[PDB]
From Swiss-Prot:
Source organism (scientific name): Homo sapiens (Human)
Intrachain disulfide bonds: none
Alphabetical list of PANTHER family matching this protein: HUMANIN-LIKE 4, HUMANIN-RELATED
Region spans: Sufficient to interact with BID and BIM and to suppress BID and BIM activity: 1-12
Record Pfam families: Humanin (PF15040)
Annotated phenotype, changing P3A: Abolishes neuroprotective activity
GO molecular function, a single term: signaling receptor binding
Name of the protein in its database record: Humanin
Effect noted on mutating C8A: Abolishes neuroprotective activity. Formation of short irregularly shaped fibers with BAX with fibers showing non-uniform diameters. Formation of thin irregularly kinked fibers with BID
UniProt entry tagged with the keyword Nucleotide-binding: no
GO CC field: cytoplasm; extracellular region; extracellular space; mitochondrion; nucleus; perinuclear region of cytoplasm; sperm flagellum; sperm midpiece
Family: Belongs to the humanin family.
Region (Sufficient to interact with MPP8): 5-12
Encoding gene, per UniProt annotation: MT-RNR2
Effect ascribed to mutating L10R: Abolishes secretion
Amino acid sequence: MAPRGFSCLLLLTXEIDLPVKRRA
């Protein structure tokens, strides 16, 4: 898991929209 930051800011841009949609 990321330090709830680098990947946290990318979640807003939609970059990391995989762990917030479906099981995938």
